[PDB]
């Protein structure tokens, strides 16, 4: 009864994930040869000319969200949706530094020019600056109120500027960690932010056609710097600005909208601007001969010019630019990476290695070497060991497909009522049959190598046989509703179909007659499978339950919770009564049909799973998901014991009196030290509370004492510290702050040590200073309150004098009395 573990071996069929950013990398001294692309939880580096993956960088259970290469080029920073930041060494391929300050998906990373500091932005409204060399986090900035879009350093005076999904741009002083300037120009999200022209111009992209620009000048009064609205340049795209980027030490400004076309802009600077101004002035002089402020204004608008815009096959997610001719690399929704060259032509594509859409159907060959995956408009064949695409065919669509017993041919179903045949060697379509009126949903292979069965949206179910390879229809069975799935018995005796109404009906193969009906699902059954013995059939529905039935009498053995959403596909292992299931809950589970028990959970994918396949030997399992990826699992020799695996899922100060003496002791030590420091001229606690006098530090300790615990803490306090505290109390009264608390403290010490204080002659000067200060300060505080007493009383009498004038007199008196009547609780 011992079970075995399935382990995820490799990931294939992915070129580039839709979320993320594409970046060039420098390997072996070739800047433009290699590119780094993000996939599901992993990041891949490709060689565009060869078309091969040089190396893969390992990930851990979380999708990668954004990329940033280090300025030196040895390292590239990786951010994930969890919030962990990991930096990978390109040559070694292993990253050993982990940064996990953030609590949400990481939006952007950026390096400074030297590479010593790293800035991270996340959807949570925080900015964290990390020390790259020391592998520590310096400080956190919390000003923004929405997700962070872009964060950029300033080289000249160590300033950071950030933009967010909220309609604000915030400037930060890194030395003091303070936000000194805020821009409120825009009305909508600030999606893009770039620095240009040696940190003298600012560019922002918003959800509007116009593109604004500012000029920055270095020094409600402005602080540190000032910015003015320089102007605006128009965009051809009428949609939001997805990306703004500027090539490193380059003159190309790139604007990208939601549409596929990518817009490029070229700046004019240094002598080029001056030469253009001189040419314009000469042209104006020539016009004057034929027959200024306007010319200068014309020069300002033409400071940046529009070069021809590059167009791509489909919409772009992320792009990167490099300048030596401009080389631009792109990423699309299709997992396709393209490069274009312009001073536009497409120089290469890496379309090979992945389908252009979601792979909906998945099949294995009769032998285990070959793996068939098909999607919309594509069919590909994979070698199981090598993991390379053998051959590709264009198809109308793919919903169902089986591998014919001949190793040479393949058969697929379409969402249109068509069926197609291909050879692996020929790579051509044999013929196209109008098999069904509607969409063909399911199709099954008979144990004897002759024939196959088709069912689809058209209410009939049709039988076909193989006849160069061709197929013909023998007989059809007509139903009341459409058929979601057909599953054919291991022997030629039974045939099973699933209908729109929540029932599975079994028909005799030979005579096409009713034999049983299986009901009890709230929602229609999507997937079915029958074991090799034929005793058991498992049905999974849109409702989360899966049910096991006996074929002999149609009795339900068990009903299982299974997934948290609709189950998508089901299939038994070949040897025994163990089946694999897949649902929209991002998970894969396997069950023992005999013991009705859940053995394992596979947790590779990150999106809902469309299809699954298991090898005829049963050793290998391949699955497909909404994320454009394909994963392979292999059975391992290590035994699996259930309750241990069940256990794995379960697993996955100082007293008041004591403070006073320490405060006094700290005061004594510092005064001796500062005495010595001045002598030379001719602690951490202090800066912890902010730089203050040592005398001041004791004052808050007195404030920190609770009111109730005040008297006994002073009573416990020894007489050795009494001479010092009396001196310190004298300073506190003279400042005039917190007089009452010190006076209450002072008078308590004098009474309790009245006998001892009199004897000591050293304390005579202290009491003389205390005597003068105490009465002098208390009187002044009382006099200020006393003066307010007289002033307020006079104003009270004037208001009452006015009231008598109005005194209809009875009504006014009643209103006055009603105003001055309060209500109290009383036990009568």
């Amino acid at each position: 009864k011992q079970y075995l573990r399935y382990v995820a071996s490799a990931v294939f069929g992915v070129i580039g994930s839709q979320k993320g950013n594409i970046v060039f990398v420098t390997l072996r001294g070739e800047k433009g040869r290699y590119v780094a692309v993000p996939a599901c939880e992993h990041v891949f580096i490709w060689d565009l000319r060869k078309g091969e993956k040089i190396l893969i960088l390992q990930g851990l259970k979380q999708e990668v969200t954004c990329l940033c290469p280090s300025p030196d080029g040895l390292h590239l920073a990786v951010g994930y949706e969890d919030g962990s930041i990991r930096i990978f060494s390109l040559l070694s391929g292993e990253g050993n530094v982990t940064f996990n300050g953030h609590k949400a998906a990481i939006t952007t990373l950026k390096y400074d020019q030297l590479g010593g500091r790293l800035a991270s932005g996340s959807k949570d409204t925080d900015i964290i600056v990390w020390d790259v060399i020391n592998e520590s986090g310096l400080y956190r900035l919390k000003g923004h109120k929405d997700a962070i879009t872009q964060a950029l350093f300033l080289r000249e005076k160590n300033l950071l500027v950030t933009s967010g999904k909220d309609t604000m741009v915030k400037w930060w002083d890194l030395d003091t960690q303070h936000c000194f300037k805020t821009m409120v120009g825009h009305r909508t999200e600030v999606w893009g932010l770039v620095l240009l022209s040696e940190e003298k111009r600012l560019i922002t992209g918003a959800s509007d056609s116009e593109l604004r620009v500012w000029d920055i000048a270095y020094l409600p009064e402005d602080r540190i710097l000032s910015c003015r609205k320089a102007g605006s340049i128009m965009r051809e795209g009428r949609d939001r600005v997805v990306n703004l980027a500027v090539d490193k030490t380059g003159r190309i400004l790139a604007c990208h909208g939601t549409d596929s076309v990518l817009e490029l802009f070229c700046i004019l600077s240094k002598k080029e601007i001056q030469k253009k101004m001189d040419k314009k002035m000469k042209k104006a002089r020539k016009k004057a001969k034929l027959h200024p402020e306007v010319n200068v204004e014309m020069s300002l608008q033409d400071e940046i010019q529009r070069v021809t815009n590059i167009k791509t096959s489909a919409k772009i997610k992320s792009f990167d630019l490099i300048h030596s001719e401009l080389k631009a690399v792109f990423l699309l929704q299709n997992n396709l990476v393209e490069l274009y060259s312009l001073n536009p032509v497409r120089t290469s594509r890496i379309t090979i290695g992945g389908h252009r859409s979601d792979v909906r159907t998945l099949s294995f060959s009769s032998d285990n070497i070959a793996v068939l995956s098909a999607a919309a408009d594509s069919i590909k064949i994979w070698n199981r060991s090598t993991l390379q695409c053998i051959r590709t065919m264009t198809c109308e669509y793919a919903l169902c497909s089986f591998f014919v017993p001949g190793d040479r041919q393949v058969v697929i179903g379409t969402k249109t009522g068509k069926l197609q045949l291909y050879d692996l060697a020929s790579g051509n379509l044999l013929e196209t049959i109008d098999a069904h009126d509607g969409a063909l949903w399911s199709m099954s292979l008979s144990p004897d190598q002759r024939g196959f069965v088709t069912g689809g949206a058209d209410k009939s179910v049709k039988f076909w046989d193989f006849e160069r390879l061709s197929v013909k229809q023998t007989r059809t069975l007509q139903l009341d509703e459409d058929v979601l799935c057909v599953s054919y018995s291991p022997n030629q005796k039974l045939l099973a179909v699933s209908l729109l109404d929540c029932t599975v009906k079994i028909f005799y193969v030979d005579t096409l007659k009713f034999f049983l009906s299986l009901y009890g699902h709230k929602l229609p059954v999507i997937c079915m499978d029958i074991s090799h013995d034929g005793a058991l059939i498992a049905t999974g529905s849109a409702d989360r339950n899966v049910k096991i039935w006996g074929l002999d009498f149609g009795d339900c053995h068990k009903s299982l919770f299974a997934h948290d959403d609709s189950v998508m596909y089901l299939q038994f292992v070949p040897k025994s009564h163990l089946f694999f299931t897949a649902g929209k809950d991002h998970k894969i589970k396997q069950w023992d049909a005999d013991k009705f028990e859940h053995i394992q959970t596979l947790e590779g994918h990150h999106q809902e799973i469309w299809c699954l396949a298991v090898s005829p030997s049963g050793d290998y399992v391949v699955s497909s998901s909404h994320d454009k990826s394909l994963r392979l699992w292999e059975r391992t020799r290590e035994p699996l014991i259930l309750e241990e695996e069940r256990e794995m899922e379960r697993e996955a100060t100082v007293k008041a009196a004591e403070r006073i003496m320490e405060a006094i002791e700290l005061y004594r030590e510092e005064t001796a030290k500062m005495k010595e420091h001045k002598a030379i001229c001719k602690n951490p606690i202090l800066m912890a509370y902010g730089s203050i006098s040592p005398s001041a530090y004791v004052l808050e300790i007195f404030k920190g004492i609770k009111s109730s615990e005040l008297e006994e803490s002073l009573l416990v306090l020894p007489f050795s510290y009494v001479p010092d505290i009396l001196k310190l109390f004298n300073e506190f009264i003279q400042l005039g702050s917190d007089v009452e608390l010190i006076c209450r403290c002072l008078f308590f010490l004098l009474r309790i040590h009245f006998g001892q204080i009199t004897s000591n002659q050293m304390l005579v000067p202290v009491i003389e200073k205390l005597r003068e200060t105490t009465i002098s300060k208390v009187s002044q505080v009382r006099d200020v309150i006393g003066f307010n007493m007289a002033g307020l009383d006079y104003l009270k009498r004037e208001c009452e004098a006015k009231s008598e004038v109005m005194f209809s007199h009875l009504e006014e008196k009643k209103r006055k009395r009603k105003k001055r009547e309060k209500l109290i609780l009383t036990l009568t």
């Binding site: 919903l399 459409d482 979601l484 729109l500 999507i526 609709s566 998508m568």
Partner: peptide, 8 residues
Amino acid sequence: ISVHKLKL
């Protein structure tokens, strides 16, 4: 209800 919403 249609199978397109459920399976496709």
